[model samples]
Target chain A: LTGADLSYANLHHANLSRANLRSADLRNANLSHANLSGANLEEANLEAANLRGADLHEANLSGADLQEANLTQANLKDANLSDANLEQADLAGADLQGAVLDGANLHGANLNNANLSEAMLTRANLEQADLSGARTTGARLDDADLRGATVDPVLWRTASLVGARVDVDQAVAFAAAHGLCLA
Target chain B: LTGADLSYANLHHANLSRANLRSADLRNANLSHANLSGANLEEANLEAANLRGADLHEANLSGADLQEANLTQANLKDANLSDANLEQADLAGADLQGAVLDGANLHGANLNNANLSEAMLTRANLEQADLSGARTTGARLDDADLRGATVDPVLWRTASLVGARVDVDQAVAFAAAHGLCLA
Candidate 1:
């Protein structure tokens, strides 16, 4: 499916592991529960796609456009999603453990209950995102933009937020939660 | 210390475990790190007392007056604290695991970093209380009064909030965090 316009395609539960789908247009495609493990999906256009429960483990999704996509309960473990555009996406309960999300634009995304343990999200844009109940244990969030994001101060318990931008009213709380004295 | 007037006493680091101190007046006492385990302290007056790091495990403290008391890091595991007055008290880092706090008055209390796992707090008053960083795994919070309390929406993850009263604004976020749904 290399460089093909697969818009609105129904690939639900299909086994397409390790397939070369680079630069493919999958806009509004139904790929729910599909096996896309180790697939090459670089620079693909997947806007408004239904990828719920899809297995994208170890897949290369660099620079892909997933705006407004539904990725609920998707297995994105160890996937390479660096520089991808996931604006306004619903990723609730998605497993992103050990995934590389560096420089990704995830503005207004819903990541409620998502597992991001050990994921590298350095320099990512997460403005106005919903991270309620999300697990970021040992996640690298260096230089991440978190302004207007809905998050708890305790979320910094095991996550690194060095150089992260946040609202002014929340700076004191974040500092206190991270155990940094202001004295 | 049985039913005696021990007001303004300084008994710091004292070991009075399993002693009968029911209805005793211990107002303004310094009992920090005191071992009061299995002691009968029901209806005792502990107002403005310092019970920090005290071992109150399995102790009976029903209807005790603990207003403005400092119970930081105190162990009350499996103890009975029903109907106790804990208004304006500091329970930071205190362990109340498996304890009974039914109908307890906790208004303006600070429960930060406290462990209430598997504890009973049904119908308890928590107005203006701070519950930041509190561990409530498997806690039974049925019908608890939480108006004006500073609580995290993440508490619904491992705890049940059936019929819990709260500020309407905070309720919306709690509902959203409980699970995603319309309105």
Candidate 2:
């Protein structure tokens, strides 16, 4: 039986790959650069967890509470992030290509430079989120809420954005359809 | 060639059928309902010439200068108007389906209600042209200049108007990406 409280734990570069951390209380935990590849983290309470550069590929994070988590540069490719609470999460430079993020709560999240190609983000709420430089080519944004979302020209392309939240001046962004390249 | 001047020349319902008159000038000439079927008038000039209801089926008018010409209700089915100059021409109600208009100059032309289905208009210059109610399904307009082109709600659905100069209001309607039909 492991101890319940893991707050402020220094898990940098720790080898917790494929570990069963279900229902664990890891709030405010410092897990930067942690090797959590293939971990079963379902229903874990990781509020305010620092997971910068953590390898979370193919992990089961369904129904987890990751609110205010710092996941910068984390690799979440092919991860199950459905029904997760990720309000105010920092996900800059994260590789989430082909990830399942449908119905995820991403309010106020920073997703800059994240690769979301072919990701299912249907009905996701992205209100007031910063998505600059995000690559969402062929991503499904059907019925998503993007009201007050800030996006660069590169993100506009390849995003279905049908029935999704967008700005009023979407016309000006069409010029970049053929000319602009992702910086 | 009679000095090749045809300003206001009335050839209404005149049967010049299959006549071979290449490189002749006919600017501002009125040839309404004139039967020029299978005619070999290649490289002839018809600038601002009126050819309403004229039958030009199977005609060889390739490389002809028809800039600012009036081709209203003209039947050009299966005609070879390839590489022709039709800048600012009026083609309202004209049937150009299956016609070869590749590399044609149609800048500022009015093609309202014109049947251009399956027509080859690749690389054509259609800047500021009006294509309201035109049937352009399966038409290849790739790399065509459609800047400031006026499009109806019906035409917006059938064409892939990407890279075309369309306002915001028109861009929204064109996102349907389906068959176009006016009610």
Candidate 3:
């Protein structure tokens, strides 16, 4: 798509879904509110893209660069985001139910109010991530680096963790590594 | 670099080794043959980057996106690809020795000629994936998904898929698929 230098272009709310965007230059593009559902975004560079309110349901976004992207309110249900880089992405209020985020990077990410029900998050990194108001029902957090992560008591009650690094406020863990309520 | 887009950038063969790529946007970037040794790719968006022949030795690829990325001939020794997505990704000839793929998604991914020696694939999904010609010496496949996966005779002989999800007919089919050769 270059010749046209689509890099850093503002294509917010664009409908470039399912397009063969392989090797296309879209660095710093604004794809906010776009309908990229079922699009083949494999290996596509989406570093720092604004994908807020994007419809990425069932889209193959594996291996795509999403570093520092704004993915607020994005629908990623059952999507494959394994091995994806989501460092510092704004996923507030995003619908990630049943999504595969295993081995995914979420360090320093803001996941406030995100829905991660039944999502696979084993061995993932969440160091210093903000998870206030996040809904992680049945989410797996085994061996995850969640040190210094902020989580709501309601959400944390429903999450499953095995060998995860969680910093409790005061209470000690007796059975599981429970993050004590910050009361 | 908040909102710094890197969509569709060609980072092929670039030495991003040991770099702090946390939360950086790298969607659709060509990272093939790139040396990402010891790089921190946590939470970065890599929706569809080309990582063919990339050296991810000791790199922290946790939670990184790898959907449909070409990891052919990539060396991922000791790389942390845990919880990463490899759905439909071409991992043919990739070296995954000592890599941690716990809870990672490998649905429909190709693993031909891939070396998985001592790799920890606990709770990883390998459903419908191809494993022909893959060498597995001391690889751990606990709780892995082997449903609908294609296997090689030699590789299957040495695989330890304890507690993995596999159908009885599919197990027979797997043996038949590989000519039932255990030697």
Expressed as tens digits, the lDDT of each residue in B48-150 for candidate 3 is 7888889889989788788888889998999998898878889899999999999999999999889999999988988899988888888887678777788
Candidate 1, residue A168: CA error in Å? 25
Q: Write the per-residue lDDT of candidate 1 for residues B45-72, one digit (tens) a residue.
A: 9999999999999999999999999999
What DockQ does model 3 achieve? 0.01
Model 3 chain A weakest lDDT span, ten residues long: A174-183
Runs in model 3 deviating more than 4 A are A1-183, B1-4, B173-183
Comparing candidate 1 with candidate 2, which one achieves the higher DockQ? 2
Instruction: Identify the superior model by DockQ, candidate 1 or candidate 3.
Output: 1
User: Which structure among the candidates has the greatest TM-score?
Assistant: 2
TM-score of every candidate? 0.51, 0.76, 0.47
DockQ of each: 0.02, 0.16, 0.01
Q: How large is the C-alpha RMSD of every model relative to the true structure?
A: 10.8, 4.9, 28.8
Q: Give lDDT: candidate 1, residue B160.
A: 63
List fnat, each candidate: 0.00, 0.03, 0.00
Please give the range of 10 consecutive residues that has the lowest summed lDDT in model 1 chain B.
B174-183
lDDT of 3 by residue, A5-96 (tens): 46788787788767666555566888888887877776677788888898998877777778898899999988888878889989999999
